[PDB]
Each structure stands twice: as structure tokens, then as C-alpha cells.
């Protein structure tokens, strides 16, 4: 049924090219191919015919041997190529020596099994799947192109360069697309890239499937606006059609594989929907001797291509009147000046085809030289041609391609190669083209970022979350993926170890400004500048000056013409007690130092108690008379009474040794306080309170009695004032939280009141 092209010779080589589009989804069972193809279908047929004609006229390469061919149609479909390969093998049930093609991984895999059942080597030029390099299964397979693992590496490098760490993925269903996409997924997952979702679709699907695919793709916007397409040309074209149909042009960026490299046919009528895309292609220049032969072809002089007359009419949209293949459907007749030089775009993969054709010829040349050493032609030792020997000789091939480089196969039949990176953009007013903006080779990627962007409007590098990594904020992964997160502030007294933790620190420390741990808290003790201690110091110095003045006055008047009623030594003791109280008040907050606190405790215990006990003894001396042991020695006994209080102070040192330590009433601030047992302070207070009660009772006993200097009259007032001030000062100690200056004020006021109400009449009289 199907037509086959052929030229005769001593050696016949098969070839499967897709001259027609694959059957649509409604015609897959009938296997009815679509419309003709020019670059993928008809340039390759002429290329093979002319290459064989060129080889046949080369004395150096295979002298005295003619090369024929048998070119068939695969239609980019597995079933059609399978049945054409069935014809190839039925020719050997002139035998076919080898097969060149096809151009897809799935079709190549389907053909390879049947070919290897009959020992037929097969050389491909665009099947870049990375599972076709398993020589355990695909033993008779060789190719002149590298596998698509390097292509996945290049795509990962490109997404890494521009910090696209949240992308969508799509691949056409098949061996090539799935293998490439799984390799890309593994590489990106290892390198830290992120995929929102993964989709797949057939290249021959309907419009509804592509519309649903586009809706699912755009449901992830605006977080993921970069799409990694590992698809074929028709899948990308269908995506462009869907975008124009929906009206969503300009919301995506598309990464391309060799499926969409520079093919202008995918971007025709849908160029606005595809501007900005970046594609990856194999590196190969344009063959110059193919164009010269191809541009001069006419339909009336071509007597070996069965699909040429139809092509002419399909391309020029006219009817060839009178020709055998007239196809009288087009309304316009074909002019006699139509030429192929117009809108010529050579296939960007012709060098690979020509190198794949030359590989078989060189392998045959080497095999013949090995088998028939001196004979020029096919000797009896090479009749019939063996497939195992040809496979052995083809794996050792080494020659120079049309482009000038050296072609040689590795242990898996693959060949090295480079990669170019193309950018689709607008170069004028409604003029779009593909521009080279970089290359990839041997793991090294070199791009030109000024041509790609040329502005500050580089598309927002597709991410799922803004970076909330500043020190004071932790990161929470919701659970869907380690790719999207929510950032929440770390607390005021908590720092961070990693980006996702918030741990506090113990009391007495604060986190730093950058929240990299807690160092310490500075303590405050500079109370000298506070107004209250300054006022206390002023009061203490005034009291000390008054005490010094009265002491000097008493010393100068030590004769005591009328003061002799009161004991001079007792008055000196009272003055010394007042001075000690003033010194304590002045040094009440001398310093936290242990010695300072020791001195403060000793003075507070001694001075007021000693002075008040001396006053008690003075009052009780005049109480005996309305018996006496020793009036002169009693004062000495009074001294012992003061010593008693000293012993009480000693008891405090027995109770607990005071010290200065840091006390923290709140996290914000920590103070430094000298030790002061709450129960310890009570005992001296109780003792002096009992003494106050005793002296008040004694004074009330002789309150109304007469006195020479009205001493008994002023004693009751002094006792009442001291009792009142002590009763007022007792709750104040258990009052405010600081409890550091209230007792100083209380004792200073008590000392001043005692001083006044004690010797105001003496001062009045002495003047």
C-alpha cells in the first residue's frame, strides 16, 4: 500500500523518515497519516539520496561498490514504523543491511527489538533518550547524538542561574519525555529546586485536554510562573494555541528541550504567546552543499521522490495542472516561476543525518578491508554480509564529519556534543526571531544576561515564599512541602538557633540586637545622682553639723554651773550616740561591699539603742526619789546595758553572715542587694520597743512632778514623739518594695527629734 523510495545498488540500506504527520486521535486505529512535512520529512529524503549519490562517486570511500537504498515512512507513529520494519524483515525471511532512523525514542525502541531479532544494526540521529544506551537490551543501536542527561543538567543549571526555585513541570507522554523529566526531577531535588506540580499529556490530544492542562497550570499562579517543558514540538504548539484561545498571553515563561529548539513551525500565528521563552538545542552548523542541490529541484524533473509533486502543491497552495499527481482541490493554478529559494529554512538537524549516513559507509569500508584485503569489490568472503561483523566494525568507527569535527562512538554507542541556548524575542515591529544567548559544554554554562533581560524587569524569580530570615523571626513549614513557609516573630526574651526555632534564655540575660543568643543584663547601682539620696546626705550633714556645734558648746562650758544636775559623761555619751546615728544615716548606702553592710548593721544596732538606753537611765535616776545601790556606778552599769545590745548584734553574725548578691525582681531589670534577713531585723526592733515601753511607763509615773529645769516636763514629750515615730516607721519597713532609704529617714528624724526635745531648754537658757 504505502509508497517507498529507492535507488539500486549492491548494498541496500533502509531508512524511516516521517514524511507525514502522525494519525490524529480519531484515526489511530485505521493508521491514516496527516499532512506532509518539509524539514522533518522531505529534506531528509533528498539528503539521503544525494549523500548516497555523492558516496557512489568517491574512489576513496568504498571503491567498486554501489550503494542503494529503501526509504519508507514512519509518520512519527509506532504502528506505522513497526509495519514498515516488518516489510524490511520480510525482505529477508536483496536483504537490508542497516537502518537509519527513526527520529523518536519510543518508535526507535519499538523498531529496535524487531531489528535485533534479525541482526540488523541501527544508527539514529535524534533519539536522545538515556535508556537506549543499555546495550544489554538495545545491543544493535548506535547514535551520533548524546543522551539527554546532559540536557537535564543544562536545564537545571539554567534554573539555578536565575534563582527560579519554584517551578511547574510538563512533559509529553512517552519514553523521551518521561525519562528526561524524571532525570530533571532528581537533579533539581538534589540541588534544592522546587516543583509545584507535575503534568503530562499526549502530543495528539484534543483541544479540551490542552485547555484543562492550561487551567491546571494557571491555577498555581502567581507563585509559580516558570514552566519546565520537556515536551515535543506539537505539545508546545498546543500550549500556545490554548493560551491564545483562553487569552492568557504573557503570564508564563517556558523552558524548551530539543523538541522545541528553533523550529519556526511551532511559533507561527502564536508568536506573541511565546515571546521570552528559552530553548536548549544541539550544536550543528548548516551544510552548504545540501542547499545548492535542494534549491534547484523542480517537480517535473524529479523522478525518484514519490512525495515531491504533492509537497510542491502543499507548500505553494496551488494545483499542478496536467501533472499525474494533480490533486485538483486548490483553486489557484501553479505558476511556472515558483522557486524553493523563497522562505527557505534548512532543517537544523541535517548534519546529524548526514553523519549517520556516513557512519554506515565507513563501517562497511572497514569491514570490507578486513575481510577482502587485496580484492577491490565484494569477494566471496563477504557474501552474504554478516550482521555481527558489521556491528563489531561499526563500534570502532572514527572519521571526520561534514562540520569538520571528529565522529567516534563510545562504549555505549553515543557521541559527544555541545548545547546552544536560544531566546525567542521581538526584534522590531511584528518581527520575531530566535537569538543565541549562551552555550553549555562539559558541565560549563556561559550565558549572556544583557540580551535576555536588558532591563530591571527580570521576571520575578518564581518563589513560594519571601525570605523571612532576619534573626527575630522563625519559619514554620505547613506540611505540604519544605518549599513554602509562614514566618512568625520570635519572642522578646527568646533567641534563635536555626531558622525554625525560638528558644528563651534564663533570667539575668537578654538577647542581642541580632538575636544570636543572650549575653547578660547590666545592673544598676548609681543611686548617688538620684535626688532622694542627695537630700538624705544634706539632712545627715546638717544633723552632724548641729551635733558638732552642740558638742563644742558643751565642751567649752564643761564647768556646768547649772548643767551639773545632768552628768557630763552622760551628755557626752548621748552626743556620741547622736553622732553615730548621723554617721550611719550618711553611710546608710555607703556601698554593697560586705564591710560597708557590716558597718551599717553594726551602727543601726548600736547607736539609737545606746543613746535611748542612756536616756532611759537618766530618766530612771530621778525616778527613785519620790534603796539606791550606787548612784555614781549606776552609769557604768548603764554602759553594760549598751554592751547587751552589742551581744544581740553578735547573735546576728551567729544567725547568718550577711553578703551582697544579685536579686532579680523582674526579667527586664536586675539589682544588687546586700543580705538582710527579715527575721533578724525584728529582734533589735523588739528590744528597743520594749525599752520604749519601759521608759514611757517610767515617764508617765513622774510626768506631773516638778523639776528644777522642767526636765520632767520635756521628758514626756520626747517619749511620746519617739513612740509615735517608731510606730509610724514600723509599717513603712514592711511597705515599699525598695526598702533602702525609708529606715534612714526614720532613724534620722527620730535622732533629730530626740536631740531637739532633749536639749532645746539648755540652748535657750545658755543664751
Amino acid at each position, epitope marked *: 500500500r504505502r509508497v517507498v523510495a529507492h535507488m539500486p545498488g549492491d548494498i541496500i540500506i533502509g531508512a524511516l523518515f516521517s514524511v507525514h504527520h502522525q494519525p490524529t486521535v480519531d484515526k489511530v486505529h485505521e493508521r491514516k497519516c496527516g499532512a506532509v512535512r518539509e524539514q522533518y520529512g522531505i529534506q531528509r529524503v533528498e539528503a539521503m539520496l544525494h549523500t548516497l549519490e555523492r558516496i557512489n562517486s568517491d574512489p576513496t570511500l568504498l571503491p567498486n561498490i554501489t550503494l542503494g537504498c529503501e526509504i519508507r515512512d514512519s509518520c512519527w507513529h509506532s504502528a506505522v514504523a513497526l509495519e514498515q520494519s516488518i516489510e524490511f524483515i520480510r525482505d529477508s525471511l536483496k536483504p537490508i543491511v542497516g537502518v537509519i532512523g527513526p527520529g523518536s525514542s519510543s518508535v526507535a525502541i519499538q523498531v529496535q527489538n524487531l531489528l535485533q531479532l534479525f541482526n540488523i544494526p541501527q544508527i539514529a540521529y535524534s533519539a536522545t533518550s538515556m535508556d537506549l544506551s543499555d546495550k544489554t537490551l538495545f545491543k544493535y543501536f548506535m547514535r551520533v547524538v548524546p543522551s539527554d542527561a546532559q540536557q537535564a543538567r543544562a536545564m537545571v543549571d539554567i534554573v539555578k542561574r536565575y534563582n527560579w526555585t519554584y517551578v511547574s513541570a510538563v512533559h509529553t507522554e512517552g519514553n523521551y519525555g518521561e525519562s528526561g523529566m524524571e532525570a530533571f526531577k532528581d537533579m533539581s531535588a538534589k540541588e534544592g529546586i522546587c516543583i509545584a506540580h507535575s503534568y503530562k499529556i499526549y502530543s495528539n490530544a484534543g483541544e479540551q485536554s490542552f485547555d484543562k492542562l492550561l487551567k491546571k497550570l494557571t491555577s498555581h499562579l502567581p507563585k509559580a510562573r516558570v514552566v519546565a517543558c520537556f515536551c515535543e514540538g506539537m505539545t508546545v504548539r498546543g500550549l500556545l494555541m490554548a493560551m491564545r484561545r483562553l487569552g492568557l498571553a504573557g503570564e508564563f515563561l517556558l523552558l524548551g528541550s530539543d523538541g522545541w529548539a528553533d523550529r519556526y513551525d511551532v511559533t507561527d500565528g502564536y508568536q506573541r504567546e511565546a515571546v521570552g521563552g528559552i530553548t536548549i538545542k544541539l550544536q550543528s552548523p548548516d551544510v552548504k552543499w545540501f542547499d545548492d542541490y535542494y534549491l534547484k529541484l523542480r517537480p517535473e524533473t524529479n523522478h525518484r521522490n514519490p512525495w515531491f509533486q504533492e509537497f510542491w502543491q502543499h507548500r505553494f497552495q496551488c494545483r499542478l495542472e*496536467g501533472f*499525474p499527481q*494533480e490533486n*485538483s482541490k486548490y483553486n489557484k493554478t501553479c505558476n511556472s516561476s515558483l522557486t524553493l529559494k523563497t522562505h527557505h529554512v534548512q532543517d537544523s538537524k541535517m548534519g546529524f543525518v548526514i553523519n549517520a549516513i556516513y557512519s554506515m559507509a565507513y563501517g562497511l569500508h572497514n569491514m570490507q578491508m578486513s575481510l577482502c584485503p587485496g580484492y577491490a569489490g565484494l569477494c566471496d568472503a563477504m557474501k552474504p554480509i554478516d550482521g555481527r561483523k558489521l556491528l563489531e566494525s561499526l563500534m570502532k568507527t572514527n572519521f571526520t564529519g561534514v562540520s569538520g569535527d571528529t565522529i567516534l562512538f563510545d562504549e555505549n554507542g553515543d557521541s559527544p556534543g555541545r548545547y546552544e541556548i536560544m531566546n525567542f524575542k521581538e526584534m522590531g515591529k511584528d518581527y520575531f526571531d530566535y537569538i543565541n544567548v549562551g552555550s553549555w559544554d562539559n558541565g560549563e554554562l556561559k550565558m549572556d544576561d544583557d540580551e535576555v533581560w536588558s532591563k530591571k524587569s527580570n521576571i520575578i524569580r518564581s518563589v513560594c515564599s519571601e525570605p523571612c530570615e532576619k534573626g527575630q523571626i522563625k519559619v514554620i513549614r505547613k506540611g505540604e512541602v519544605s518549599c513554602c513557609w509562614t514566618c512568625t516573630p520570635c519572642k522578646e526574651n527568646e533567641y534563635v538557633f536555626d531558622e525554625y526555632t525560638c528558644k528563651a534564655c534564663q533570667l539575668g540575660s537578654w538577647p542581642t540586637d541580632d538575636l544570636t543568643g543572650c549575653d547578660l543584663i547590666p545592673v544598676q547601682y548609681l543611686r548617688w545622682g538620684d535626688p532622694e539620696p542627695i537630700a538624705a546626705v544634706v539632712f545627715a550633714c546638717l544633723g552632724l553639723l548641729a551635733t558638732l556645734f552642740v558638742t563644742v558648746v558643751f565642751i567649752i562650758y564643761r564647768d556646768t554651773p547649772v548643767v551639773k544636775s545632768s552628768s557630763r559623761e552622760l551628755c557626752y555619751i548621748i552626743l556620741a550616740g547622736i553622732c553615730l546615728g548621723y554617721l550611719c544615716t550618711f553611710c546608710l548606702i555607703a556601698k554593697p561591699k560586705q564591710i560597708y553592710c557590716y558597718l551599717q548593721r553594726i551602727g543601726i544596732g548600736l547607736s539609737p539603742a545606746m543613746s535611748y538606753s542612756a536616756l532611759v537611765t537618766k530618766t530612771n535616776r530621778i525616778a527613785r526619789i519620790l534603796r539606791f545601790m550606787s548612784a555614781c556606778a549606776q552609769l557604768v552599769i548603764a554602759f553594760i546595758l549598751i554592751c547587751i545590745q552589742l551581744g544581740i548584734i553578735v547573735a546576728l553574725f551567729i544567725m547568718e553572715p550577711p553578703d551582697i548578691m544579685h536579686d532579680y525582681p523582674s526579667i527586664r531589670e536586675v539589682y544588687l542587694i546586700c543580705n538582710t534577713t527579715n527575721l533578724g531585723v525584728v529582734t533589735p526592733l523588739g528590744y528597743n520597743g520594749l525599752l520604749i515601753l519601759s521608759c514611757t511607763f517610767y515617764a508617765f509615773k513622774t510626768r506631773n512632778v516638778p523639776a528644777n529645769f522642767n526636765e520632767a516636763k520635756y521628758i514626756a514629750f520626747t517619749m511620746y514623739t519617739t513612740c509615735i515615730i517608731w510606730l509610724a516607721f514600723v509599717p513603712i519597713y514592711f511597705g515599699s518594695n525598695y526598702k533602702i532609704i525609708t529606715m534612714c529617714f526614720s532613724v534620722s528624724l527620730s535622732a533629730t527629734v530626740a536631740l531637739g526635745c532633749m536639749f532645746v531648754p539648755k540652748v535657750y537658757i545658755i543664751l
Partner: nanobody
Amino acid sequence: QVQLVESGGGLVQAGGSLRLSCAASGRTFTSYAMGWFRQAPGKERESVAAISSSGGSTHYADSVKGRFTISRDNSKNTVYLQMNSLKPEDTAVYYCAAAMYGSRWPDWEYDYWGQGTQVTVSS
């Protein structure tokens, strides 16, 4: 290869009608355009009519234009030539030929030929 066999000819009187049939072997008959030739005794072969590979367009010579017709059946896999108002100058041997790689008619580069059928027209 493809083998062409002609049938339907024979003795006929002037003013009658006839139908010739050319049948082809093989299975790729739909890829070949077809043509009919006739040669009278004492003369050389002449083109008569032709049809392209898928019908659609038919070409007739001047001497047979209007009173001849040609058609093909791809399903039946055979071509028919219908004659009307025959004339005494139509007695000849007819051949059926297949072409694939031609130019504008009647330049067609035929490659498969038939055996032929003798047709005699008497007054």
C-alpha cells in the same frame, strides 16, 4: 510490479457504443495515473485519454473529445473507457498504461504497459 489486462473489445458496427476495462494487479494501484493509447495498422501509437491518480481531472485528445469518457474505480481497482458514436476510423489495437513521474500531459513517463485489445469498427 503491476500487471495490466484489457478487456471488453471486439467486433462492433458503426454508430454503436462500447466500454473497455483495464484491470491492474498489485495493491498500490491508487498511486498511479492511467492513460489509454490506440494504434491503427500501418500507423504509430497515439494518445487518446488519461486520468490522474485520484480521478478529479481527466484529459482527452482532440480526435476523441466529447464522444469519449474515462473513469476509474479504486475500490474495484480498475479503469473504464466509454465510447459513443463510433466511426470507421477507430479500428485499432488499444493499450493501457500507468504513470507516476510525469510532466504536463501528454508527457507522463509511463512504466507499466498492457497487452492490448483489438477493436474493429465496420460500416
